[PDB]
RNA sequence: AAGAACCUUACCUGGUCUUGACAUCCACGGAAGUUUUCAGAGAUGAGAAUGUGCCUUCGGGAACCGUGAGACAGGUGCUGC
RNA sequence: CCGGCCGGGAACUCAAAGGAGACUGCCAGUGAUAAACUGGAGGAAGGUGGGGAUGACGUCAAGUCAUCAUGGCCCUUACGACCAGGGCUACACACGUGCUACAAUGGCGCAUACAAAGAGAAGCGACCUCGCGAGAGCAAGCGGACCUCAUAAAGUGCGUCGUAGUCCGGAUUGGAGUCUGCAACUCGACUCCAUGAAGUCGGAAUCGCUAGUAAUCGUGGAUCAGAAUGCCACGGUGAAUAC
RNA sequence: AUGAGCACAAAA
């Protein structure tokens, strides 16, 4: 069940955390206006696969891309099962 | 898909939670994932010990569990050694110190996980399904509470067409939210396919 | 000396404090003609005072939070009725005959799942 | 002048925790203001009930965090010693603040 | 007061605070707050408390 | 539509354009990057831009400056 | 589908890998990790520089990495009749 | 110092905990001397007070082997795996669901009044300054009844337009940009300048709604770097009609 | 106005 897809998301998380917040934030700072340029032409060397936007939120149980909920961390199908067994604390059917 | 989960509808009213910790927005998903991993490992290691409920309470410096077992001698092993290795490996799985607490459960024929797991083991061992749910229903009724219903669905007796067959004795009111119903399901995986067990047990009203 | 009314609409809580004095009334540190005298429903404010057949003998001080215009007007009317309850007891026959003693429990129902509003279903095709 | 706020998913549990805090603050003798209830956060989640296509068939959930503040204003040495492990409940998330 | 400045990983002690007489490691130090966050576990739950630099003095 | 703070050009395509202008007239440069804004340095060359299955050749002249490379390579085929 | 810009990608053209991108077993080793050059569309392929510990009965523990062999891994392939 | 001012019983509102309260409980009539019904007193609410959750045995071999798990079959140097670009956004057409309109109960300018519900740490982001604007500047606060999103809008007075394809309508297009992200050609969202298609209330047919209902008006959340006219929730005004 | 034929193992 989507082993390659979960592997790509794990590799994306590892590569983004490795190459980001040590170089990418500085490149974005120099890209921002100080409060063509040789500085920005030196800047334009960025690789691609380190980006945080390439990551997609997948369910930890099943790896499902769609229907994700961030506070629970699972897709809706798994969230309903965990709620019905009673694993998510404070979850109740809003009968309002 | 008509019927709602009984534990789910009466979770607010009568039944306490299987996990009773508090966390904020940031820690909620990872605490659920850690709870899933420790419960998966405990169920995998102690399926032969037949645990019913693994109640998890996290102070959020450590994590403590209140595991429910029909035979506590199996989980403690000899002099608590199996408990000790299980505590250490569940601690370094969870990444946080752990305390294991075991509660001996009374009436193992009157609790639903062990009824469903016994019927599941009988379907692994090719006991006929009518005798399996009939013994489960009659043993629960003679040992105790006034509600029992066992529904077993899918490929009954090696048929090419799946059927749903259910026996029921006593009174099992699902619509009343005052009722003490414990619903637990277990899947039996035969050679010709998979077959599912649905067990209701009605203790009484609170 | 001060007679108090609770004054709720289903959206607005109008605390009304009535004293004897001048007939000019004040709604949230502001006159009633400034508040909604440009609008309607000034008469529905005056109606509990009109049931006593005099307005000028009493001084009314009103603070009201929540709701909209007609909701605040109805909550103000309810508060004036409860403050006249604190005034006297023989007014209850006339106020109950006018039905102003009751509280309006017509709230807005919630939006239900699968409908565009509370009652409104989407359009339906048999094909 | 330490003011201690506390939140839980369960209203009975947060009531027992707040009762323990006011009893411990009151046995030694301390001027503590009354336990005031902050409003509860109601987190409505709304999920589909079916694996495949059923848009109208859809489930609705809730988390109700009950937040309370115990409002201590008098500090005493036995009080600040006895606040250690007061609530003693896993559901109750207490926070010491000034 | 001497040693009024605190850093992540430093003992703290408050006369009016409940986190004294036990071990204390701070959470965050903010100059704009003019006060520092101290993270001491209470019944096994980590809790931040903000305390003025003149108010808290190390042991 | 892009920001004023920077135009965009791929580094490999830019260095290949530099090799092309220091070499002179040459073979069509094969690029797989349609994202790149062309330049007055690239005005005059005969590079080839890829569009799905096949690469089409494009002779860059003065009328195409701010446009990307992929506007001259068609992605679809209708009729 | 509660969110299709190469990225979520299953589909297409092309460049590539075959005990494998994701697991466990065997043997040979090297800590890990970090910086940087040449190409290439990138995957990758050649080089280098830095670091090289907690160990124990120096068994260089154990992770991680690479390499050779099968056991196998993988499948969003078919049948919801 | 118009900061609902600060000692503050805390009145009242508000918040959330324990309760009270409505049960045909009374009083006449009908019926059988029965359930029950019709009226009225009381009361906030009267007969199920309103809404919601709760969906029996089963039907359709209804839907999902693509959420997951799984029996059988199949590939297993190729139906597996990693990359760059492209596609899922195409377009002689036909249908469903919505949004904006066809104006005068309206459009446009100025001045003003009244909410509820939510979200926020790889976050919401004041104030002040700059820019016609979208926005941009080492700028406080707040993991929250305090800080931010955040301006509610229909309404209300004033002034203008006086039935035109119009000061109605905004599609389309050409220039100039801002944001986001490694990059907005394919294939983003807004701002500004200019253009101003169809559209004069809609054939056969057809949909929703019995009360805070329909219409109409805005607000917030999820997903999400960015992108709703979709979804989910929130309140303002508020009908007509059941012989 | 009409609607191909088969596709209901459900058992000591």
UniProtKB/Swiss-Prot annotation, chain A:
Pfam families: Ribosomal_S14. Transmembrane segments: none annotated. GO terms for biological process: translation. Keywords: Ribonucleoprotein, Ribosomal protein, RNA-binding, rRNA-binding. It comes from the Bacteria. InterPro entries: Ribosomal_uS14 (IPR001209), Ribosomal_uS14_bac/plastid (IPR023036), Ribosomal_uS14_CS (IPR018271). GO terms for cellular component: cytoplasm; small ribosomal subunit. GO terms for molecular function: rRNA binding; structural constituent of ribosome. Part of the 30S ribosomal subunit. Contacts proteins S3 and S10. HAMAP family: Ribosomal_uS14_1. PANTHER family: 30S RIBOSOMAL PROTEIN S14, SMALL RIBOSOMAL SUBUNIT PROTEIN US14M. Belongs to the universal ribosomal protein uS14 family. Binds 16S rRNA, required for the assembly of 30S particles and may also be responsible for determining the conformation of the 16S rRNA at the A site. This is Small ribosomal subunit protein uS14. It comes from Escherichia coli O8 (strain IAI1).
